[PDB]
Ligand binder design. Structure first.
Ligand SMILES: NC(=O)C1=CN([C@@H]2O[C@H](COP(=O)(O)OP(=O)(O)OC[C@H]3O[C@@H](n4cnc5c(N)ncnc54)[C@H](O)[C@@H]3O)[C@@H](O)[C@H]2O)C=CC1
Lengths: 295, 217, 337, 56
């Protein structure tokens, strides 16, 4: 409409932008002092970086979606800000998966004994994950530098070449499949961790009941936030990408799909705000350093 | 780098690898600080499982190092912090010592338990409380009433009631019941379930510590 | 009994009267005229990493380059401080060591702790591997400090309220010092190695003649256990850090406390004490995760060495005074210039 | 036991009582003079040039 994606969606983006940038800037301030003694802290550091980059991309959305200085704001949001936001979102998703796998490996102590699994050298795998995500995302900014056919109607795929459009469809499908692989792995690993927590701690005492309840609440919060933020987006990202790169088959579903995609992407972006309260806060060294500095 | 400098860097890297391997091996070990009084059954527990007595034993694929600091006879405050990162503390209390005196022996045992449990270095360290000599305590509870140790005791003068009362009195000394757990076992002579109890307690402690290290508890 | 106690009280009163008589002025007013040292801005040049548990002791080499450190993980690491390289890594039979020493010749390293034994390791073995050369049996209490006095004798203090000079070749206590009432927590050998001061848990420091074996002087004033002690470079004075938040500088010739180094903002105890090469700076490690560099002459806090995430358990200064190495409970050694 | 310890403590106090103590002013002056003499040779009082610094 006119008061949904221009007068409301930008406002919610501004709210999530502030409530994410403040927390993630404080978290980046704290995490520079927190040593990387374990892979969990390394992944939390990378997640802080990704969330800060997403929060930095948010003002471009807010403004360009609401209003243009030149049309350069809108074509730039198509070109630069959106690609960085998406690559950082999927970096955050795969790092959530990596955190899930290390939690499974530590708590469960699986049958992968005699195999190294994921112990140490997590900086290298974090770097190769960033490199794979950027290898997927760079063509989506280099190939989208086409002229603007209509100044006021600027669809992000109209600014894209034949190879550009082919790789846009390929990257979306690949990223949706990557998210679903990470989501299945995360569900499996957290189910296994919850099963490991279910055993033991049979004392009906304050400590045992407290540790079971808190661990289960944290796991349920992690899985629920992951679901609510990302599953609505990626169960509707494939149809929306089909709608973008579409032979003529629709008239108005191309609009309800875009509203659905924008709202589900806002849901996924809300994780920049919901991330410190479920991931960083429970980190013992991070909380200790914050309590030492923030008092 | 020169040949000597290259060799020195290679030697340092070999030392680094050896240190990493040693630390990986040591992080899998369960550290158990053993504490108690003179009348406590620490010796019997050690036998069934100069300054510090170190006992290494493997149970159910877990390697335990139990460190007995008895006989140190020095100020605990100057070296107890050396056990700050200990996995668990096994505190032994002789039940039959309720009627004995050095001040009652069990009162001194309670004072030591409260000092160990409520000091700064063991805020979150779990305590396995062994209540030894349950057979002798049951034999002697029929003649010496528990009132001489706990004048406020009002329950029946039976073994079960008195044992539960003593265990509750020791557990009430915990000032961090929300964070620290006290595992109480009634050890005695010819008891083969003590090491299994320690294994279960340290398994619970290890799961808690893993959850904490994962940012999950 | 009563008569002996009365005589002891009279002797203590006479000692206090003599001390008050010889205290005509104070160190603070004599050093009030001299210019302040300013602000110490020492920076971390090296970070020796590789220890995996709390570091309890360190000791510089007489070459001011090699540096031994002891960790609770049962490791005694000899570092090349210039290049950060690890020259040696000795696996200790007991992981509960709380002290370590470096021989002035550099041929041996001492360690010890809760096992009540001082282990002397030979670094210059012909086989190329470091092996323990001696184990000193004695000290029915935990051994808290050891200081090499040449390559054949060593002074070690323990938690049985006694110190001992051992002959390493024979392994037997040549001399025993049995004046302290509380656990002796620190040692310091004079530059001539003819006297040494020991601070104990009885809030007392004692000066012992190594050759005579008797206590020369006793120094009081601290309100809690003395954890660290160090001679002035002149050897005519020493500094003590204790469980209260104050250091104290005592003088042997005056037999009195010259200076106190305390601050209201400091409430934690003091773990390590060392002087700079000139003795103008007094470096003390604290429980508040820092090191304070005081103007030893002016008692002013000249600077703060910060960068240890846990308690600074030990610190030392090189023989040439180029650097200061501080180990901490965070398993890290930091070298500062 | 107690009598022997008390006698030993009395003897030690007597030995530590009859010693030659110099004035605090003289000892403090000597300490200050030692600090002043070695001020130029202390690398921590004044920063050594990075060329001569082995920890640069
Ligand atoms: N997984 C993915 O989908 C990835 C996509 N990219 C690239 O990022 C770019 C973004 O593509 P899409 O978001 O699918 O295109 P789109 O048509 O959904 O919108 C493009 C971007 O511009 C903004 N925008 C433009 N017009 C808007 C309007 N009327 N209302 C609200 N927002 C508006 C949106 O916030 C969006 O981020 C694409 O060029 C794509 O190649 C890059 C990496 C991964």
């Amino acid at each position: 409409n006119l008061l949904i994606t221009q007068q409301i969606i930008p406002v919610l983006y501004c709210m999530v932008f502030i409530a994410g940038i403040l927390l993630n800037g404080v978290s980046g301030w704290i995490f520079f002092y927190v040593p990387s003694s374990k892979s969990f802290i390394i992944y939390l550091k990378n997640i802080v970086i990704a969330d800060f980059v997403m929060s930095l991309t948010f003002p471009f959305k807010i403004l360009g979606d609401s209003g243009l200085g030149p049309w350069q704001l809108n074509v730039f949001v198509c070109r630069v800000s959106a690609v960085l936001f998406y690559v950082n979102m999927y970096v955050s998703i795969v790092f959530f998966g990596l955190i899930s796998f290390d939690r499974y490996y530590k708590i469960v102590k699986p049958l992968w004994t005699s195999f190294i699994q994921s112990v140490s050298y997590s900086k290298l795998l974090s770097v190769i994950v960033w490199m794979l995500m950027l290898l997927l995302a760079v063509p989506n900014i280099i190939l989208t530098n086409q002229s603007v056919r209509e100044v006021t109607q600027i669809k992000c795929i109209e600014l894209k070449s034949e190879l550009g459009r082919k790789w846009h469809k390929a990257s979306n499908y690949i990223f949706v499949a990557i998210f679903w692989i990470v989501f299945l792995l995360l569900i499996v690993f957290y189910t296994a961790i919850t099963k490991k927590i279910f055993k033991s701690h049979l004392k009906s005492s304050r400590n045992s009941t407290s540790v079971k309840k808190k661990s289960s609440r944290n796991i349920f919060s992690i899985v629920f936030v992951f679901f609510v933020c990302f599953v609505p987006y990626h169960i509707a990202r494939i149809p929306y990408t089909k709608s973008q790169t579409e032979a003529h088959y629709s008239c108005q579903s191309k609009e309800i799909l875009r509203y659905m995609k924008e709202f589900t992407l806002l849901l996924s972006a809300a994780n920049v705000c919901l991330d410190p309260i479920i991931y960083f806060f429970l980190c013992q060294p991070f909380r200790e350093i914050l309590c030492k500095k923030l008092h | 780098l020169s040949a000597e400098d290259k060799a020195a860097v290679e030697r340092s890297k070999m030392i680094d690898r050896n240190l990493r391997e040693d630390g990986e091996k040591a992080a899998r070990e369960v550290k158990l600080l053993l504490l108690g009084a003179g009348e406590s059954g620490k010796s019997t527990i050690v036998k069934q499982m100069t300054g510090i007595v170190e006992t290494h034993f493997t149970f159910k694929d877990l390697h335990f190092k139990m460190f007995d600091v008895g006989g140190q006879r020095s100020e605990r405050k100057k070296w107890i912090h050396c056990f700050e990162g200990v996995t668990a503390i096994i505190f032994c209390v002789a039940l039959s010592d309720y009627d004995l005196v050095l001040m009652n022996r069990m009162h001194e045992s309670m004072k030591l338990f409260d000092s160990i449990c409520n000091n700064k270095w063991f805020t979150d360290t779990s305590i396995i409380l062994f209540l030894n000599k349950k057979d002798l305590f049951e034999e002697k509870i029929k003649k010496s009433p528990l009132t001489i140790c706990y004048p406020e005791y009002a329950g029946s003068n039976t073994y079960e009631e008195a044992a539960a009362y003593i265990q509750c009195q020791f557990e009430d000394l915990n000032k961090r019941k929300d964070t620290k757990e006290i595992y109480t076992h009634f050890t005695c002579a010819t008891d083969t379930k003590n090491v299994q109890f320690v294994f279960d307690a340290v398994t619970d402690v290890i799961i808690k510590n893993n959850l904490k290290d994962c940012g999950l508890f | 009994l009563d008569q002996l106690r009365q005589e002891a009280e009279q002797l203590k009163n006479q000692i206090r009267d003599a001390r008050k008589a010889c205290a005509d002025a104070t160190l603070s007013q004599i050093t009030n005229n001299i210019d302040p040292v300013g602000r110490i801005q020492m920076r971390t040049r090296r970070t020796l990493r590789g220890h995996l548990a709390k570091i309890y002791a360190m000791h510089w080499g007489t070459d001011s380059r090699l540096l031994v450190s002891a960790s609770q993980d049962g490791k005694l690491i000899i570092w090349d401080s210039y290049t950060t390289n690890k020259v040696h890594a000795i696996p200790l039979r007991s992981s509960w060591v709380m002290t370590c020493a470096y021989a002035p010749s550099g041929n041996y390293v001492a360690c010890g702790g809760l096992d009540n034994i001082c282990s002397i390791y030979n670094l210059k073995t012909r086989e190329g591997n470091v092996r323990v050369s001696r184990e000193l049996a004695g000290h029915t209490g935990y051994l808290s400090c050891c200081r090499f006095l040449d390559d054949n004798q060593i002074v070690t203090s323990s938690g049985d309220t006694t110190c001992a000079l051992w002959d390493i070749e024979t392994g037997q206590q040549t001399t025993t010092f049995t004046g302290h009432t509380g656990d002796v927590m620190s040692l310091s050998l004079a530059p001539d190695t003819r006297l040494f001061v020991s601070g104990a848990c009885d809030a007392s420091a004692k000066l012992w003649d190594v050759r005579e074996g008797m206590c020369r002087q006793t120094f009081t004033g601290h309100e809690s256990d003395i954890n660290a002690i160090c001679f002035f470079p002149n050897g005519n004075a020493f500094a003590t850090g204790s469980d209260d938040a104050t250091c104290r500088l005592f003088d042997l010739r005056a037999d009195q406390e010259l200076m106190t180094y305390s601050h209201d903002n400091i409430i934690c105890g003091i773990t390590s004490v060392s002087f700079s090469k000139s003795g103008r700076l007094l470096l003390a490690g604290y429980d508040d995760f820092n090191c304070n560099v005081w103007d030893a002459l002016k008692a002013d806090r000249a600077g703060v060495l910060a960068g240890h995430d846990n308690r600074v358990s030990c610190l030392g200064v090189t023989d040439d005074g180029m650097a200061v190495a501080t180990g901490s409970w965070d398993s890290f050694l930091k070298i500062w210039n | 036991a107690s009598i022997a310890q008390a006698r030993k403590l009395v003897e030690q106090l007597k030995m530590e009582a009859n010693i030659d103590r110099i004035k605090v002013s003289k000892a403090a002056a000597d300490l200050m003079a030692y600090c002043e003499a070695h001020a130029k040779e202390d690398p921590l009082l004044t920063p050594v040039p990075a060329s001569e610094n082995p920890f640069r």
